[PDB]
mmCIF file of C-alpha atoms in Angstrom:
data_model
loop_
_atom_site.group_PDB
_atom_site.id
_atom_site.type_symbol
_atom_site.label_atom_id
_atom_site.label_comp_id
_atom_site.label_asym_id
_atom_site.label_seq_id
_atom_site.Cartn_x
_atom_site.Cartn_y
_atom_site.Cartn_z
ATOM 1 C CA UNK A 18 -16.998 -7.389 -22.005
ATOM 2 C CA UNK A 19 -16.896 -10.081 -19.071
ATOM 3 C CA UNK A 20 -13.766 -11.772 -18.270
ATOM 4 C CA UNK A 21 -13.813 -15.548 -18.473
ATOM 5 C CA UNK A 22 -14.269 -17.391 -15.096
ATOM 6 C CA UNK A 23 -12.074 -20.374 -15.437
ATOM 7 C CA UNK A 24 -12.530 -23.994 -14.205
ATOM 8 C CA UNK A 25 -13.302 -24.495 -10.433
ATOM 9 C CA UNK A 26 -11.723 -27.627 -8.658
ATOM 10 C CA UNK A 27 -14.674 -29.858 -7.986
ATOM 11 C CA UNK A 28 -16.381 -30.125 -4.416
ATOM 12 C CA UNK A 29 -14.358 -32.219 -2.012
ATOM 13 C CA UNK A 30 -10.966 -31.387 -3.838
ATOM 14 C CA UNK A 31 -8.176 -31.286 -1.020
ATOM 15 C CA UNK A 32 -4.693 -29.678 -0.790
ATOM 16 C CA UNK A 33 -2.537 -30.366 2.164
ATOM 17 C CA UNK A 34 0.878 -28.802 3.735
ATOM 18 C CA UNK A 35 2.068 -27.776 7.090
ATOM 19 C CA UNK A 36 -0.435 -29.755 9.043
ATOM 20 C CA UNK A 37 -3.054 -27.597 6.973
ATOM 21 C CA UNK A 38 -5.901 -29.105 4.820
ATOM 22 C CA UNK A 39 -7.967 -26.958 2.257
ATOM 23 C CA UNK A 40 -11.121 -28.553 0.955
ATOM 24 C CA UNK A 41 -13.342 -27.288 -1.842
ATOM 25 C CA UNK A 42 -17.071 -26.847 -0.631
ATOM 26 C CA UNK A 43 -20.160 -25.114 -1.957
ATOM 27 C CA UNK A 44 -20.527 -21.453 -1.526
ATOM 28 C CA UNK A 45 -23.866 -22.104 0.481
ATOM 29 C CA UNK A 46 -21.943 -24.302 3.017
ATOM 30 C CA UNK A 47 -20.721 -20.677 4.378
ATOM 31 C CA UNK A 48 -23.227 -19.734 7.059
ATOM 32 C CA UNK A 49 -25.256 -16.510 6.211
ATOM 33 C CA UNK A 50 -23.726 -16.456 2.685
ATOM 34 C CA UNK A 51 -26.948 -15.550 1.365
ATOM 35 C CA UNK A 52 -27.466 -12.369 3.570
ATOM 36 C CA UNK A 53 -23.820 -10.702 3.142
ATOM 37 C CA UNK A 54 -23.239 -7.164 2.402
ATOM 38 C CA UNK A 55 -21.483 -8.196 -0.790
ATOM 39 C CA UNK A 56 -21.220 -4.737 -1.998
ATOM 40 C CA UNK A 57 -19.073 -3.960 0.909
ATOM 41 C CA UNK A 58 -16.928 -7.193 0.411
ATOM 42 C CA UNK A 59 -16.489 -5.909 -3.274
ATOM 43 C CA UNK A 60 -15.514 -2.525 -2.191
ATOM 44 C CA UNK A 61 -12.902 -4.284 0.108
ATOM 45 C CA UNK A 62 -11.739 -6.416 -2.752
ATOM 46 C CA UNK A 63 -11.238 -3.594 -5.143
ATOM 47 C CA UNK A 64 -8.905 -1.791 -2.686
ATOM 48 C CA UNK A 65 -6.532 -4.863 -2.525
ATOM 49 C CA UNK A 66 -6.595 -4.883 -6.364
ATOM 50 C CA UNK A 67 -4.672 -1.744 -6.838
ATOM 51 C CA UNK A 68 -1.658 -4.168 -6.066
ATOM 52 C CA UNK A 69 -3.233 -7.536 -6.233
ATOM 53 C CA UNK A 70 -3.975 -7.140 -9.833
ATOM 54 C CA UNK A 71 -0.382 -7.327 -10.585
ATOM 55 C CA UNK A 72 0.078 -10.812 -9.180
ATOM 56 C CA UNK A 73 -0.066 -13.924 -11.537
ATOM 57 C CA UNK A 74 -3.454 -15.284 -11.662
ATOM 58 C CA UNK A 75 -5.401 -12.477 -10.175
ATOM 59 C CA UNK A 76 -5.611 -10.042 -13.216
ATOM 60 C CA UNK A 77 -8.832 -11.337 -14.539
ATOM 61 C CA UNK A 78 -10.926 -11.314 -11.236
ATOM 62 C CA UNK A 79 -9.358 -7.669 -10.278
ATOM 63 C CA UNK A 80 -10.263 -6.484 -13.872
ATOM 64 C CA UNK A 81 -13.682 -8.187 -13.452
ATOM 65 C CA UNK A 82 -14.220 -6.700 -9.832
ATOM 66 C CA UNK A 83 -13.996 -3.146 -11.614
ATOM 67 C CA UNK A 84 -16.725 -4.109 -13.972
ATOM 68 C CA UNK A 85 -19.110 -5.269 -11.223
ATOM 69 C CA UNK A 86 -21.484 -2.829 -9.714
ATOM 70 C CA UNK A 87 -21.092 -1.820 -6.205
ATOM 71 C CA UNK A 88 -24.435 -3.632 -5.050
ATOM 72 C CA UNK A 89 -24.875 -6.981 -3.094
ATOM 73 C CA UNK A 90 -26.889 -8.574 -5.919
ATOM 74 C CA UNK A 91 -24.159 -8.374 -8.606
ATOM 75 C CA UNK A 92 -21.361 -8.789 -6.111
ATOM 76 C CA UNK A 93 -22.715 -11.909 -4.925
ATOM 77 C CA UNK A 94 -22.772 -13.247 -8.320
ATOM 78 C CA UNK A 95 -19.155 -12.111 -9.094
ATOM 79 C CA UNK A 96 -17.943 -14.055 -5.868
ATOM 80 C CA UNK A 97 -19.927 -17.171 -6.763
ATOM 81 C CA UNK A 98 -19.129 -17.174 -10.393
ATOM 82 C CA UNK A 99 -15.405 -16.344 -10.251
ATOM 83 C CA UNK A 100 -13.998 -17.826 -6.926
ATOM 84 C CA UNK A 101 -14.068 -21.275 -5.195
ATOM 85 C CA UNK A 102 -14.285 -21.669 -1.605
ATOM 86 C CA UNK A 103 -11.640 -23.655 0.364
ATOM 87 C CA UNK A 104 -12.491 -24.614 3.974
ATOM 88 C CA UNK A 105 -9.458 -24.490 6.175
ATOM 89 C CA UNK A 106 -8.386 -27.170 8.691
ATOM 90 C CA UNK A 107 -5.291 -26.464 10.838
ATOM 91 C CA UNK A 108 -3.676 -29.532 12.596
ATOM 92 C CA UNK A 109 -7.025 -31.561 12.190
ATOM 93 C CA UNK A 110 -9.180 -28.776 13.595
ATOM 94 C CA UNK A 111 -11.740 -26.247 11.645
ATOM 95 C CA UNK A 112 -11.666 -24.399 14.666
ATOM 96 C CA UNK A 113 -9.280 -21.524 15.096
ATOM 97 C CA UNK A 114 -8.735 -18.035 16.711
ATOM 98 C CA UNK A 115 -10.136 -14.664 15.853
ATOM 99 C CA UNK A 116 -8.903 -11.471 17.499
ATOM 100 C CA UNK A 117 -9.378 -7.750 16.663
ATOM 101 C CA UNK A 118 -7.414 -4.695 15.798
ATOM 102 C CA UNK A 119 -8.168 -1.192 15.049
ATOM 103 C CA UNK A 120 -6.719 2.273 13.991
ATOM 104 C CA UNK A 121 -6.505 4.551 17.126
ATOM 105 C CA UNK A 122 -7.974 8.233 17.182
ATOM 106 C CA UNK A 123 -5.927 10.474 19.597
ATOM 107 C CA UNK A 124 -6.292 14.120 20.436
ATOM 108 C CA UNK A 125 -3.441 16.289 19.261
ATOM 109 C CA UNK A 126 -2.230 18.981 16.999
ATOM 110 C CA UNK A 127 -0.219 19.629 14.078
ATOM 111 C CA UNK A 128 1.897 21.846 16.408
ATOM 112 C CA UNK A 129 3.057 21.923 19.867
ATOM 113 C CA UNK A 130 0.489 23.712 22.082
ATOM 114 C CA UNK A 131 -0.214 23.826 25.819
ATOM 115 C CA UNK A 132 -2.436 20.666 25.437
ATOM 116 C CA UNK A 133 -0.351 18.716 22.943
ATOM 117 C CA UNK A 134 3.187 18.401 23.951
ATOM 118 C CA UNK A 135 4.366 14.729 22.803
ATOM 119 C CA UNK A 136 6.054 14.704 19.284
ATOM 120 C CA UNK A 137 5.365 12.139 16.716
ATOM 121 C CA UNK A 138 8.487 11.293 14.902
ATOM 122 C CA UNK A 139 8.987 10.482 11.249
ATOM 123 C CA UNK A 140 12.287 8.564 10.130
ATOM 124 C CA UNK A 141 15.093 10.353 11.841
ATOM 125 C CA UNK A 142 17.983 12.193 9.683
ATOM 126 C CA UNK A 143 20.497 9.714 10.854
ATOM 127 C CA UNK A 144 18.491 6.688 10.875
ATOM 128 C CA UNK A 145 20.252 4.187 8.471
ATOM 129 C CA UNK A 146 18.415 0.760 7.508
ATOM 130 C CA UNK A 147 20.750 -2.089 6.355
ATOM 131 C CA UNK A 148 19.695 -5.415 4.694
ATOM 132 C CA UNK A 149 20.856 -8.801 6.706
ATOM 133 C CA UNK A 150 22.412 -11.818 4.741
ATOM 134 C CA UNK A 151 31.943 -7.356 13.400
ATOM 135 C CA UNK A 152 31.209 -6.266 9.740
ATOM 136 C CA UNK A 153 31.498 -3.577 7.477
ATOM 137 C CA UNK A 154 28.995 -0.893 6.399
ATOM 138 C CA UNK A 155 28.747 1.642 3.585
ATOM 139 C CA UNK A 156 26.059 4.182 3.181
ATOM 140 C CA UNK A 157 23.821 3.923 0.023
ATOM 141 C CA UNK A 158 21.197 6.673 0.502
ATOM 142 C CA UNK A 159 20.295 9.467 3.194
ATOM 143 C CA UNK A 160 18.432 6.591 5.141
ATOM 144 C CA UNK A 161 19.882 3.383 4.034
ATOM 145 C CA UNK A 162 23.152 1.508 3.833
ATOM 146 C CA UNK A 163 33.496 3.402 5.702
ATOM 147 C CA UNK A 164 32.218 2.363 9.302
ATOM 148 C CA UNK A 165 32.377 -0.691 11.217
ATOM 149 C CA UNK A 166 29.257 -2.650 12.661
ATOM 150 C CA UNK A 167 29.037 -4.904 15.844
ATOM 151 C CA UNK A 168 26.604 -7.513 15.027
ATOM 152 C CA UNK A 169 26.359 -8.934 18.471
ATOM 153 C CA UNK A 170 25.270 -5.535 19.782
ATOM 154 C CA UNK A 171 22.046 -5.136 17.257
ATOM 155 C CA UNK A 172 18.756 -6.714 18.292
ATOM 156 C CA UNK A 173 19.063 -9.746 15.848
ATOM 157 C CA UNK A 174 16.758 -12.879 16.751
ATOM 158 C CA UNK A 175 15.766 -15.801 14.529
ATOM 159 C CA UNK A 176 13.816 -13.390 12.617
ATOM 160 C CA UNK A 177 15.697 -10.035 11.521
ATOM 161 C CA UNK A 178 15.147 -8.766 8.108
ATOM 162 C CA UNK A 179 17.489 -5.827 8.440
ATOM 163 C CA UNK A 180 19.501 -3.792 10.893
ATOM 164 C CA UNK A 181 18.706 -0.149 12.129
ATOM 165 C CA UNK A 182 21.372 2.213 13.289
ATOM 166 C CA UNK A 183 23.568 5.150 12.936
ATOM 167 C CA UNK A 184 27.202 6.173 12.040
ATOM 168 C CA UNK A 185 29.054 7.612 15.311
ATOM 169 C CA UNK A 186 33.031 7.919 15.125
ATOM 170 C CA UNK A 187 33.998 4.883 12.717
ATOM 171 C CA UNK A 188 31.087 2.786 14.080
ATOM 172 C CA UNK A 189 27.727 1.673 13.267
ATOM 173 C CA UNK A 190 25.567 1.287 16.323
ATOM 174 C CA UNK A 191 22.223 0.228 17.222
ATOM 175 C CA UNK A 192 19.621 2.977 16.874
ATOM 176 C CA UNK A 193 18.021 4.721 20.086
ATOM 177 C CA UNK A 194 15.715 2.822 22.300
ATOM 178 C CA UNK A 195 12.326 4.214 23.116
ATOM 179 C CA UNK A 196 13.646 5.244 26.706
ATOM 180 C CA UNK A 197 16.342 7.261 25.071
ATOM 181 C CA UNK A 198 13.780 8.914 22.508
ATOM 182 C CA UNK A 199 11.403 9.703 25.357
ATOM 183 C CA UNK A 200 14.372 11.206 27.220
ATOM 184 C CA UNK A 201 14.871 13.610 24.178
ATOM 185 C CA UNK A 202 17.682 11.790 22.030
ATOM 186 C CA UNK A 203 15.821 12.965 18.798
ATOM 187 C CA UNK A 204 15.980 16.567 19.475
ATOM 188 C CA UNK A 205 16.996 18.413 16.415
ATOM 189 C CA UNK A 206 17.276 15.281 14.133
ATOM 190 C CA UNK A 207 13.975 13.946 13.329
ATOM 191 C CA UNK A 208 10.869 15.429 11.359
ATOM 192 C CA UNK A 209 7.819 15.687 13.772
ATOM 193 C CA UNK A 210 4.572 15.208 12.161
ATOM 194 C CA UNK A 211 2.505 16.467 15.048
ATOM 195 C CA UNK A 212 1.790 16.423 18.744
ATOM 196 C CA UNK A 213 -0.289 13.926 20.904
ATOM 197 C CA UNK A 214 -1.830 15.135 24.145
ATOM 198 C CA UNK A 215 -1.446 11.889 26.067
ATOM 199 C CA UNK A 216 1.885 9.938 25.943
ATOM 200 C CA UNK A 217 0.137 6.388 26.806
ATOM 201 C CA UNK A 218 -2.437 7.122 24.012
ATOM 202 C CA UNK A 219 0.644 7.671 21.718
ATOM 203 C CA UNK A 220 2.429 4.608 23.153
ATOM 204 C CA UNK A 221 -0.535 2.551 22.031
ATOM 205 C CA UNK A 222 -0.717 4.051 18.710
ATOM 206 C CA UNK A 223 2.907 2.677 18.214
ATOM 207 C CA UNK A 224 1.465 -0.855 19.159
ATOM 208 C CA UNK A 225 -1.214 -0.650 16.420
ATOM 209 C CA UNK A 226 1.250 0.809 13.907
ATOM 210 C CA UNK A 227 -0.777 3.644 12.638
ATOM 211 C CA UNK A 228 -3.182 6.235 14.072
ATOM 212 C CA UNK A 229 -4.997 9.532 13.459
ATOM 213 C CA UNK A 230 -4.593 12.736 15.293
ATOM 214 C CA UNK A 231 -8.023 14.694 15.891
ATOM 215 C CA UNK A 232 -7.133 18.280 16.259
ATOM 216 C CA UNK A 233 -9.047 20.549 18.718
ATOM 217 C CA UNK A 234 -11.211 21.713 15.575
ATOM 218 C CA UNK A 235 -12.078 18.023 14.695
ATOM 219 C CA UNK A 236 -9.719 17.680 11.829
ATOM 220 C CA UNK A 237 -7.808 14.610 11.344
ATOM 221 C CA UNK A 238 -3.849 14.173 10.673
ATOM 222 C CA UNK A 239 -3.249 10.811 9.445
ATOM 223 C CA UNK A 240 -0.154 8.992 10.611
ATOM 224 C CA UNK A 241 1.039 5.667 9.123
ATOM 225 C CA UNK A 242 3.858 3.213 9.588
ATOM 226 C CA UNK A 243 7.093 4.213 7.901
ATOM 227 C CA UNK A 244 9.826 1.983 9.791
ATOM 228 C CA UNK A 245 11.019 1.015 13.516
ATOM 229 C CA UNK A 246 14.278 0.694 15.462
ATOM 230 C CA UNK A 247 13.963 -3.272 15.754
ATOM 231 C CA UNK A 248 14.554 -3.228 19.455
ATOM 232 C CA UNK A 249 12.417 -5.840 20.980
ATOM 233 C CA UNK A 250 8.784 -5.435 21.804
ATOM 234 C CA UNK A 251 7.960 -5.590 25.437
ATOM 235 C CA UNK A 252 4.371 -5.505 27.028
ATOM 236 C CA UNK A 253 4.240 -2.756 29.459
ATOM 237 C CA UNK A 254 0.884 -4.124 30.881
ATOM 238 C CA UNK A 255 2.810 -7.377 31.686
ATOM 239 C CA UNK A 256 5.629 -5.180 33.353
ATOM 240 C CA UNK A 257 2.932 -3.036 35.418
ATOM 241 C CA UNK A 258 1.107 -6.328 36.632
ATOM 242 C CA UNK A 259 4.322 -7.943 38.558
ATOM 243 C CA UNK A 260 5.501 -4.503 39.769
ATOM 244 C CA UNK A 261 2.746 -4.615 40.817
ATOM 245 C CA UNK A 262 1.222 -1.192 39.884
ATOM 246 C CA UNK A 263 -2.002 -2.495 38.254
ATOM 247 C CA UNK A 264 -3.748 -5.902 38.021
ATOM 248 C CA UNK A 265 -3.374 -7.455 34.340
ATOM 249 C CA UNK A 266 -7.235 -6.801 34.205
ATOM 250 C CA UNK A 267 -6.905 -3.205 34.179
ATOM 251 C CA UNK A 268 -3.838 -3.238 31.909
ATOM 252 C CA UNK A 269 -5.936 -1.603 29.145
ATOM 253 C CA UNK A 270 -4.864 1.528 27.443
ATOM 254 C CA UNK A 271 -7.280 3.426 29.477
ATOM 255 C CA UNK A 272 -6.369 1.787 32.718
ATOM 256 C CA UNK A 273 -2.804 2.566 32.024
ATOM 257 C CA UNK A 274 -3.649 6.095 30.821
ATOM 258 C CA UNK A 275 -5.774 6.796 34.242
ATOM 259 C CA UNK A 276 -2.746 5.086 36.388
ATOM 260 C CA UNK A 277 -0.474 7.352 34.785
ATOM 261 C CA UNK A 278 -2.554 10.612 35.298
ATOM 262 C CA UNK A 279 -2.499 9.655 39.099
ATOM 263 C CA UNK A 280 1.155 8.408 38.991
ATOM 264 C CA UNK A 281 3.565 10.799 36.787
ATOM 265 C CA UNK A 282 6.707 9.488 38.761
ATOM 266 C CA UNK A 283 6.238 5.928 37.011
ATOM 267 C CA UNK A 284 5.523 7.280 33.500
ATOM 268 C CA UNK A 285 9.209 7.349 32.238
ATOM 269 C CA UNK A 286 10.101 3.901 33.997
ATOM 270 C CA UNK A 287 7.253 1.950 32.525
ATOM 271 C CA UNK A 288 6.996 3.380 28.775
ATOM 272 C CA UNK A 289 10.826 2.982 28.691
ATOM 273 C CA UNK A 290 10.459 -0.764 29.511
ATOM 274 C CA UNK A 291 9.332 -1.452 25.684
ATOM 275 C CA UNK A 292 12.475 -0.573 23.786
ATOM 276 C CA UNK A 293 10.933 -0.937 20.477
ATOM 277 C CA UNK A 294 9.708 2.284 18.692
ATOM 278 C CA UNK A 295 7.975 3.093 15.667
ATOM 279 C CA UNK A 296 8.627 5.878 13.197
ATOM 280 C CA UNK A 297 5.731 7.267 11.002
ATOM 281 C CA UNK A 298 4.960 9.192 7.857
ATOM 282 C CA UNK A 299 2.260 11.563 6.894
ATOM 283 C CA UNK A 300 -0.484 10.211 4.708
ATOM 284 C CA UNK A 301 -9.365 5.755 4.939
ATOM 285 C CA UNK A 302 -7.706 2.858 6.816
ATOM 286 C CA UNK A 303 -4.162 2.132 7.404
ATOM 287 C CA UNK A 304 -1.904 0.328 4.859
ATOM 288 C CA UNK A 305 -1.596 -3.257 5.545
ATOM 289 C CA UNK A 306 0.966 -6.001 4.247
ATOM 290 C CA UNK A 307 -0.692 -5.810 0.824
ATOM 291 C CA UNK A 308 0.290 -2.242 0.586
ATOM 292 C CA UNK A 309 -3.320 -1.168 0.203
ATOM 293 C CA UNK A 310 -5.645 0.790 2.624
ATOM 294 C CA UNK A 311 -7.803 -1.500 4.948
ATOM 295 C CA UNK A 312 -11.660 -1.183 5.087
ATOM 296 C CA UNK A 313 -12.976 -1.297 8.442
ATOM 297 C CA UNK A 314 -15.164 -4.458 9.198
ATOM 298 C CA UNK A 315 -14.173 -5.948 5.591
ATOM 299 C CA UNK A 316 -10.494 -6.563 6.107
ATOM 300 C CA UNK A 317 -8.280 -8.774 8.341
ATOM 301 C CA UNK A 318 -4.639 -10.102 9.027
ATOM 302 C CA UNK A 319 -3.713 -13.754 8.312
ATOM 303 C CA UNK A 320 -0.874 -16.069 8.335
ATOM 304 C CA UNK A 321 0.957 -16.297 4.722
ATOM 305 C CA UNK A 322 2.150 -19.752 5.146
ATOM 306 C CA UNK A 323 -1.430 -20.738 5.009
ATOM 307 C CA UNK A 324 -3.536 -17.614 3.362
ATOM 308 C CA UNK A 325 -2.857 -16.440 -0.006
ATOM 309 C CA UNK A 326 -2.473 -12.610 0.462
ATOM 310 C CA UNK A 327 -5.459 -10.664 -1.109
ATOM 311 C CA UNK A 328 -7.681 -13.456 -0.971
ATOM 312 C CA UNK A 329 -11.399 -13.221 -0.122
ATOM 313 C CA UNK A 330 -11.814 -14.896 3.349
ATOM 314 C CA UNK A 331 -15.188 -15.884 4.874
ATOM 315 C CA UNK A 332 -15.065 -15.892 8.576
ATOM 316 C CA UNK A 333 -17.710 -17.529 10.807
ATOM 317 C CA UNK A 334 -17.364 -16.400 14.442
ATOM 318 C CA UNK A 335 -18.962 -14.585 17.328
ATOM 319 C CA UNK A 336 -19.409 -10.609 17.610
ATOM 320 C CA UNK A 337 -16.899 -9.616 20.312
ATOM 321 C CA UNK A 338 -19.641 -7.644 22.426
ATOM 322 C CA UNK A 339 -23.039 -9.103 21.279
ATOM 323 C CA UNK A 340 -21.514 -12.722 21.261
ATOM 324 C CA UNK A 341 -24.218 -13.228 18.219
ATOM 325 C CA UNK A 342 -23.142 -14.696 15.074
ATOM 326 C CA UNK A 343 -20.616 -12.594 13.153
ATOM 327 C CA UNK A 344 -20.410 -14.092 9.522
ATOM 328 C CA UNK A 345 -18.632 -11.849 7.013
ATOM 329 C CA UNK A 346 -16.794 -12.187 3.822
ATOM 330 C CA UNK A 347 -13.502 -10.184 4.365
ATOM 331 C CA UNK A 348 -10.594 -9.598 2.442
ATOM 332 C CA UNK A 349 -7.284 -11.086 3.820
ATOM 333 C CA UNK A 350 -4.921 -8.081 3.104
ATOM 334 C CA UNK A 351 -2.688 -7.930 6.032
ATOM 335 C CA UNK A 352 -0.228 -9.830 8.252
ATOM 336 C CA UNK A 353 1.079 -9.661 11.977
ATOM 337 C CA UNK A 354 3.984 -10.894 13.913
ATOM 338 C CA UNK A 355 1.614 -12.482 16.389
ATOM 339 C CA UNK A 356 -0.830 -14.018 13.956
ATOM 340 C CA UNK A 357 0.283 -17.719 13.096
ATOM 341 C CA UNK A 358 -1.930 -20.842 12.012
ATOM 342 C CA UNK A 359 -4.052 -22.094 9.334
ATOM 343 C CA UNK A 360 -7.284 -20.897 10.830
ATOM 344 C CA UNK A 361 -6.232 -17.420 12.523
ATOM 345 C CA UNK A 362 -7.660 -14.015 11.916
ATOM 346 C CA UNK A 363 -7.071 -10.427 13.393
ATOM 347 C CA UNK A 364 -10.126 -8.763 12.252
ATOM 348 C CA UNK A 365 -9.819 -5.317 11.299
ATOM 349 C CA UNK A 366 -12.598 -3.353 12.921
ATOM 350 C CA UNK A 367 -11.901 0.269 11.457
ATOM 351 C CA UNK A 368 -10.908 3.528 12.891
ATOM 352 C CA UNK A 369 -11.982 5.463 16.192
ATOM 353 C CA UNK A 370 -13.105 4.690 19.931
ATOM 354 C CA UNK A 371 -15.970 2.303 18.963
ATOM 355 C CA UNK A 372 -13.640 0.051 16.920
ATOM 356 C CA UNK A 373 -11.416 0.022 19.681
ATOM 357 C CA UNK A 374 -13.827 -1.296 22.259
ATOM 358 C CA UNK A 375 -14.762 -3.986 19.619
ATOM 359 C CA UNK A 376 -11.115 -4.936 19.027
ATOM 360 C CA UNK A 377 -9.991 -5.471 22.594
ATOM 361 C CA UNK A 378 -12.982 -7.481 23.323
ATOM 362 C CA UNK A 379 -12.356 -9.880 20.479
ATOM 363 C CA UNK A 380 -10.882 -13.253 21.581
ATOM 364 C CA UNK A 381 -13.282 -16.011 19.873
ATOM 365 C CA UNK A 382 -13.527 -19.339 18.004
ATOM 366 C CA UNK A 383 -13.818 -19.092 14.305
ATOM 367 C CA UNK A 384 -13.853 -20.893 11.166
ATOM 368 C CA UNK A 385 -12.514 -19.813 7.806
ATOM 369 C CA UNK A 386 -12.844 -20.438 4.271
ATOM 370 C CA UNK A 387 -10.528 -19.084 1.712
ATOM 371 C CA UNK A 388 -12.008 -17.937 -1.727
ATOM 372 C CA UNK A 389 -9.579 -18.079 -4.682
ATOM 373 C CA UNK A 390 -10.031 -17.587 -8.431
ATOM 374 C CA UNK A 391 -11.348 -20.669 -10.015
ATOM 375 C CA UNK A 392 -8.479 -23.079 -10.856
ATOM 376 C CA UNK A 393 -6.221 -21.531 -8.486
ATOM 377 C CA UNK A 394 -5.231 -23.838 -5.429
ATOM 378 C CA UNK A 395 -4.418 -22.930 -2.128
ATOM 379 C CA UNK A 396 -0.896 -23.489 -1.156
ATOM 380 C CA UNK A 397 1.335 -23.848 2.127
ATOM 381 C CA UNK A 398 4.144 -21.505 1.660
ATOM 382 C CA UNK A 399 6.993 -22.578 4.081
#
């Protein structure tokens, strides 16, 4: 028994906030709307609904998504009948920026072998996260928070949700940095999820926040983001360029990997420049900001000041290699620290080497339309 659709704001309806303006337009104002693989967009929406279904105003669309066949004919009618498109302008411009991201595959093992020597660590035994409002700390769980803490020492910026540290003496000190962990500071006090063959490839898994080990027999060990040490991110590519070990055109993962194989005397130095370090957990698609697994080519990262999390999002852009028209109904199910603005999408390409090529080549103008359940308005969320 089909859910009711509810009443759309009529064409030309506007909402404004934050320099952004949202305008209701017809579905057929989206380029190549007719020719979409709406079965794939429906799959992607259904994945987000495991959590999105619980958010006020999304219950009916999420329920109805599961009573809709996985076929583009029916799935098109679902998106037409239940959602209204809101064309997005940021600061007077429909035009914005599309970049690309992906889930890396790297050679490795569940064990230390001759080939696979670089441990992937989970949350350490002494890693304690404390929420942020010369202070006092009390432990409230084996990895969360009797000891004094020196807040001037911890890496707080204008943005810090929590501090990460460990008890030592009668102190709470910042947790270990990448250079220290590289140097063996976690020996004996952190779970190891597996081993990578290449340390630069591992370094870049940290940069994407998730990955997959491909064992010598072709199996996958799936590795997801769990936490981090909250020390600042520094680009090693920008470090190498003015050192000047490589030119900032060869600053790709693959160029750093090749430089390092030829130059083992610089490995520790360069990797240690990024004091940020990500801890992982044993787990298709990484889990994004919505808390659900992302579907390759049908999910993206957005700015939540501007885009409602979980929303179908039509992106009109250019394919990062063919430069041909790339028009897609994706789901806005993730966020990034570098993704800001009304019209701004990090396009999730999926897992593996091919997705990697696509992602890095993506830096394009794009146009966006946000689809929301009929009646629900977009909102600037300061």
